[PDB]
Structure formats: C-alpha cells, structure tokens
C-alpha cells in the first residue's frame, strides 16, 4: 500500500498473510475457521504445498507467538482468466482450523449481487511495497479508498484515493477491500504502476461469487 | 555486491534469434513484481535487439513467457499495461523466452 | 551443434570459448583465433568483460591445453546492425598473445571477395545446446552445405547475400544452435563464415556473416 497508514495493531483480525520460502507474497482473508480467500492469480505458478498462511500477525519484521501458521490442503477457484484478468478469485481450505480469539476472527462478507457505487467509501489494507524504494511493508498498512467508475469495467470493482497519488501495490494482491463492514474486494490488478493518480485499482467483486464461496465453506 | 540468479533467456524478433546462449541477472532469493520484470525485459529487448517502446507499440504481437520452477507458464503481454498486484520470488523463474512480431 | 557429432579433442584448434559477463547478464559463445593476437567472432556477443579460452575440449574441466585470456579491446563492427543483426562481426584483442602450439593455432581467412558456390561442404563447430532441452560440455561439430541465398531470402527479410552466407538444408536436423554464435564456417580449411543467427526452432537454413565482405575493415582493425 503506497500513501496508507499503520493499521492499529490487530484491528482487522481477519487479515491473512501468504507466505513462501519466508517470503509474503499476496494477502488473503479469513472467511471460515478453516478457509481463507485471495486472489486466483497469486496461486497460479506456485507450490502451493510450500504456501504458509499466518493469521494473527501485524508486523512481519518481529517474532509474533499471537500468530497462527496452517498449510494448504486444498484450493477451489471459479474460472480464473489470466488474459484478461476475469474471476481472480480463489478460496484455499487450510491443515486445521483458526483458533478465534483477540488476534484472528472471521470476516463477513455482502450478499450475491450487491454492487457498490461511485463514491462509496471504503479501506484497503496489505503488506505490499510501500512506494519509492521504500520495500515491502513490515507492519501492515491500511488505506481509504473511493469506488469509482470511470475506467474501470464491470467486471471489477474499482477503486481511487482521489486527489494524490496513493493505492494498491505489489504484495498487496488478494488483500481485502472491505467497505461497510463488509468485504467487497480483493486486490486484483493495477494499471501503469502503483499509486499512479491516474488509473484506478482493480478489485475483484466478492459480490459477484457470494454464491460459489458459500458452495464451499457453508 | 550481492548475488545473482542466472535466468536462461531467448529473444526472436521477426523470426530472427541470435544463436548466443543468454542469461539474465535476477537478485537472489528476491521477490519481484510483474512491472519490475517486464521493465527488464523491455530493457533487454532494446539493448540486445534495438526493439523500442514504440516497435512494441505498433507490433502484431509482442509477448514474453515465463517458464517457472513448477512447470507452469505465464505469457505477458508486453503492449498492455495491467500488472497482476503480487510479488514472486527470482529463484522460481527457469526460463524467460521473448518474441516480437512486427507483421 | 544440432545433429553433430563429439569432436576429435584438439582437431579444431582455433577454436575459441567465450564468457561474456555484464551487469545485467551473461553469454556464452564461440569464437576462433585469427592471429596470436586476435579472435574473430560475432557482434551480438558483445559485453562489457570477456574471457577467452583457447586450446580447450572439455569446457567444464580446466584441462591443461587451455590458455585462458581476457579481450584487452573488443571492436565490434562500426555499422553493426542490432535490430535485423546485419554487420555481425567483431574483433577481441587478446591481452597477451597465445603460446601457439598444435592445440593452439590461428586459422586462415579467405581471399578478398572469395565466393563459395550453393551445395559446398563445410564445417561448424561450437559447444551450442544440441537440443531444446540438453548442452554439450565438449566440443562438437556437424557438416552443412551452402545454399543458394534464395533459400534464405524469403524467410530472412533482412538477409544480404553481399555480407552473408545461407547454409543448412532445411530437410535436415543439422544446424547450429544457441551457444554456437561467432564459431567458423569452415570450407577447404578457411574461415568462411561466422555463426550468426536462425529460427528460434533450430530448423534450417540458418545466415553466418560471410567474412570476405568485411576483409578490409578486419585488417585495418588489427593493424
Ligand atoms: C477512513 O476510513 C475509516 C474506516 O472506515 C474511517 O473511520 C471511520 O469513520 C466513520 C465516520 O466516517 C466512523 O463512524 C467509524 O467509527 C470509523 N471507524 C474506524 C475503525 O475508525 C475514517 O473516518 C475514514 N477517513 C476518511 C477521511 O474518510
Ligand atoms: C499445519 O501446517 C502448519 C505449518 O506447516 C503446522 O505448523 C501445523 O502443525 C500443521 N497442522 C496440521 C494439523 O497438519
């Protein structure tokens, strides 16, 4: 996230952290004590036998007992599309199931078709590059965000911090976008570069698959 | 001052590949983003075949693809400028193979 | 070398190996001595460090035959062309000239505008891949026949026949592949062509430069 701020420490206890070879990669969400949700792209080329999924956790840079390490037992994606970036969506069920508590909690999610409009507020969070050579984030940071609709397509929410250059950037992908309360997106793609001023992000919309992830985690 | 990964790549522009045998310098044991990589690409592709952003632009075709470490592939398409907001690592990627076609 | 054969160690004693080592990358080619002094090979092998080794079979082992030298000045063509890969040609000054020995020996270049007619033998040598999916440690080596520069004109549309060669029949699994850039086209015993460039397939024909064109330029540089 390029012009965020540092999330109060657990205030989003349903945030995820996908790991490799020590390495985080994308975010995810806690869904389901045993199911997290991400981005089907950040999944697409990997192992996913060596992927670790640490709930709990705020700074990676520091040792955390509060946190909660489960592997992947099995993935379940709906037609992701790689040339066109359609359906970046992917559900993994875990080795074990989240112990809920003061660190990890479930998120919730909106109702099958509900569309958010120009101007609704929202928050985007991750631990992506912060921007100008600063590196990738150790302590996960949070962002407000405006839906917008021009230049974007229906296919995708999208999303502008309007009036500076700040948004979504790598390692963010698969983060939640939240809104109301309620988990809307999942960091898809960016145009041109992060925190261009200029082009919106590309949020997957969790609206539009409310009905394949109750298929799954019910 | 650091060490350095060793991609084998290839570059066919028009039907023409030169016949050295080329390697790539990644960081090792680094992450890496869609935009990095592809600015390496676009930059290899001018200084070893004089190939332009603007040749890239007005061409037929103009993609790379990535062989990764677990057998997959991912072909980018060098005209559009979506990038994917993940980080990969530089030690997964076996092969890069770039073509141009201007047709 | 696609479809060749182990070379007899030593045979091909002009026979140069190159490392070729910048910021961004490396590569390997081939190149072949044409002075004590001196190593012809391609244009596009250029980088900022080159490591010459001489007298070598076994590029893996350090064998006691090798002379290992670095290019003092690498001088690549003043018009070389890298977009459609036209003018490829260049010469490595040696830092220290070569003990010359049986294993260590330059080659001759042609005649100035020395023609080669369509169907003559020749040999390419180099230690290229052999495959899509294996290298060779060794030196290895295929024989291949010139052709008429019509065979290359139609696929290659940037194909000169005033500064190159045609070589390769395309019904034949015989051709020279990555690795193999700047080594010899050797007919009659000169150094005819440079390995220059071909289908990402391997398939045949494939273009060399032809050295006769760039015989002055060679000799200014070197003088
Ligand atoms: C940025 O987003 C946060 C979270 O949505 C906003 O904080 C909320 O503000 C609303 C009123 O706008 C309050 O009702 C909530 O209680 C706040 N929630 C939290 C967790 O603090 C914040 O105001 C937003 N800032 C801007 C400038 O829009
Ligand atoms: C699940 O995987 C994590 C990380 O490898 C490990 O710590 C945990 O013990 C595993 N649990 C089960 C039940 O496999």
Same mark, same amino acid.
């Given at each position: 996230?390029?012009?965020?701020?540092?999330?109060?420490?657990?205030?989003?206890?349903?945030?995820?952290?996908?790991?490799?070879?020590?390495?985080?990669?994308?975010?995810?969400?806690?869904?389901?004590?045993?199911?997290?949700?991400?981005?089907?792209?950040?999944?697409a080329?990997?192992?996913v036998r060596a992927?670790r999924?640490?709930?709990?956790?705020?700074?990676?840079?520091?040792?955390?007992?509060?946190?909660?390490?489960?592997?992947?037992?099995?993935?379940?994606e709906?037609?992701?599309?790689?040339?066109?970036?359609?359906?970046?969506?992917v559900?993994?069920?875990?080795?074990?199931?989240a112990?809920?508590?003061?660190?990890?909690?479930?998120?919730?999610?909106?109702?099958?078709?509900?569309?958010?409009?120009?101007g609704?507020?929202?928050?985007?969070?991750?631990?992506?590059?912060?921007?100008?050579n600063?590196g990738?984030?150790?302590?996960?940071?949070?962002?407000?965000?405006?839906?917008?609709t021009?230049?974007?397509?229906?296919?995708?929410?999208?999303?502008?911090?309007?009036?500076?250059?700040?948004?979504?950037c790598?390692?963010?992908?698969?983060?939640?976008?939240?809104?109301?309360?309620?988990?809307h997106?999942?960091?898809?793609?960016?145009?041109?570069g992060?925190?261009?001023g200029?082009?919106?992000?590309?949020?997957?919309?969790?609206?539009?698959?409310?009905?394949?992830?109750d298929?799954?985690i019910? | 001052?650091?060490?350095?990964?060793?991609?084998?790549?290839?570059?066919?522009?028009?039907?023409?590949?030169?016949?050295?045998?080329?390697?790539?310098?990644?960081?090792?044991?680094?992450?890496?983003?869609?935009?990095?990589?592809?600015?390496?690409?676009?930059?290899?592709?001018?200084?070893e075949?004089?190939?332009?952003?603007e040749?890239?632009r007005?061409?037929?075709?103009?993609?790379?693809?990535?062989?990764?470490?677990?057998?997959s592939?991912?072909?980018?398409?060098?005209?559009?400028?979506?990038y994917?907001?993940?980080?990969?690592?530089?030690?997964?990627?076996?092969?890069?193979?770039?073509?141009?076609?201007?047709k | 070398i696609?479809?060749?054969?182990?070379?007899?160690?030593?045979?091909?004693p002009?026979?140069?190996?190159?490392?070729? !080592?910048?910021?961004?990358?490396?590569?390997?080619?081939?190149?072949?001595?044409?002075?004590?002094?001196?190593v012809?090979?391609?244009?596009?092998?250029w980088?900022?460090?080159?490591?010459?080794?001489?007298?070598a079979?076994?590029?893996?082992?350090?064998?006691?035959? !090798?002379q290992?030298?670095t290019?003092?000045?690498?001088?690549?063509?003043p018009?070389?062309?890298?977009?459609?890969?036209?003018?490829?040609?260049?010469?490595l000054?040696?830092?220290?000239?070569?003990?010359?020995?049986?294993?260590?020996?330059?080659?001759?270049?042609?005649?100035? !505008?020395?023609?080669?007619?369509?169907?003559?033998?020749?040999?390419?040598a180099?230690?290229?891949?052999?495959?899509?999916?294996?290298?060779?440690?060794?030196?290895?080596?295929?024989?291949?026949?010139?052709?008429?520069?019509? !065979?290359?004109?139609?696929?290659?549309g940037?194909?000169?026949?005033?500064?190159?060669?045609?070589?390769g029949?395309?019904?034949?699994?015989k051709?020279?592949?990555?690795?193999?850039?700047?080594?010899?086209?050797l007919?009659?015993?000169?150094?005819?062509?440079?390995?220059?460039?071909?289908?990402?397939?391997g398939?045949?024909?494939?273009?060399?430069?032809?050295?006769?064109?760039?015989?002055?330029?060679?000799?200014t540089?070197?003088?």
């Open positions: 996230i390029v012009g965020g701020r540092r999330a109060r420490p657990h205030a989003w206890p349903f945030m995820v952290s996908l790991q490799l070879r020590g390495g985080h990669f994308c975010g995810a969400t806690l869904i389901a004590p045993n199911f997290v949700m991400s981005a089907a792209h950040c999944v080329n990997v192992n992927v999924v640490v709930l709990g956790a705020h700074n990676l840079s520091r040792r955390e007992p509060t946190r909660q390490v489960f592997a992947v037992q099995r993935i379940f709906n037609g992701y599309d790689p040339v066109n970036l359609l359906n970046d969506i559900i993994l069920q875990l080795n074990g199931s112990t809920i508590n003061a660190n990890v909690q479930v998120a919730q999610l909106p109702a099958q078709g509900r569309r958010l409009g120009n609704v507020q929202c928050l985007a969070m991750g631990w992506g590059l912060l921007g100008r600063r990738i984030a150790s302590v996960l940071q949070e962002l407000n965000v405006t839906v917008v021009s230049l974007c397509r229906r296919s995708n929410v999208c999303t502008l911090v309007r009036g500076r250059q700040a948004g979504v790598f390692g963010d992908s698969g983060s939640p976008l939240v809104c109301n309360g309620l988990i997106g999942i960091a898809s793609f960016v145009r041109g992060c925190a261009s200029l082009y919106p992000d590309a949020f997957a919309p969790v609206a539009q698959f409310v009905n394949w992830i298929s799954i019910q | 001052a650091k060490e350095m990964q060793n991609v084998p790549y290839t570059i066919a522009v028009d039907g023409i590949m030169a016949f050295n045998q080329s390697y790539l310098n990644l960081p090792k044991d680094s992450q890496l983003s869609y935009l990095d990589l592809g600015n390496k690409v676009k930059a290899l592709l001018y200084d075949r004089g190939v332009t952003p040749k890239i007005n061409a037929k075709s103009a993609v790379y693809t990535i062989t990764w470490k677990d057998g592939k991912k072909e980018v398409d060098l005209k559009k400028d979506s994917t907001a993940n980080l990969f690592d530089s030690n997964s990627i076996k092969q890069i193979d770039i073509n141009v076609k201007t | 696609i479809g060749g054969r182990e070379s007899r160690p030593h045979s091909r002009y026979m140069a190996y190159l490392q070729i !080592q910048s910021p961004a990358g490396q590569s390997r080619c081939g190149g072949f001595l044409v002075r004590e002094d001196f012809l090979t391609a244009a596009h092998c980088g900022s460090n080159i490591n010459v080794t001489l007298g079979h076994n590029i893996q082992r350090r064998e006691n035959t !090798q290992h030298i290019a003092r000045r690498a001088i690549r063509h018009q070389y062309n890298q977009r459609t890969i036209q003018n490829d040609i260049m010469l000054q040696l830092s220290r000239r070569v003990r010359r020995n049986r294993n260590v020996n330059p080659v001759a270049l042609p005649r100035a !505008q020395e023609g080669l007619r369509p169907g003559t033998l020749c040999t390419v180099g230690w290229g891949r052999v495959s899509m999916r294996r290298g060779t440690d060794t030196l290895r080596e295929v024989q291949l026949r010139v052709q008429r520069d019509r !065979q290359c004109l139609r696929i290659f940037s194909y000169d026949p005033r500064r190159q060669i045609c070589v029949d395309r019904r034949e699994r051709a020279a592949f990555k690795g193999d850039s700047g080594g010899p086209l007919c009659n015993n000169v150094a005819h062509g440079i390995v220059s460039y071909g289908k990402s397939s398939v045949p024909p494939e273009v060399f430069t032809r050295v006769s064109s760039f015989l002055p330029w060679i000799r540089t070197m003088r």
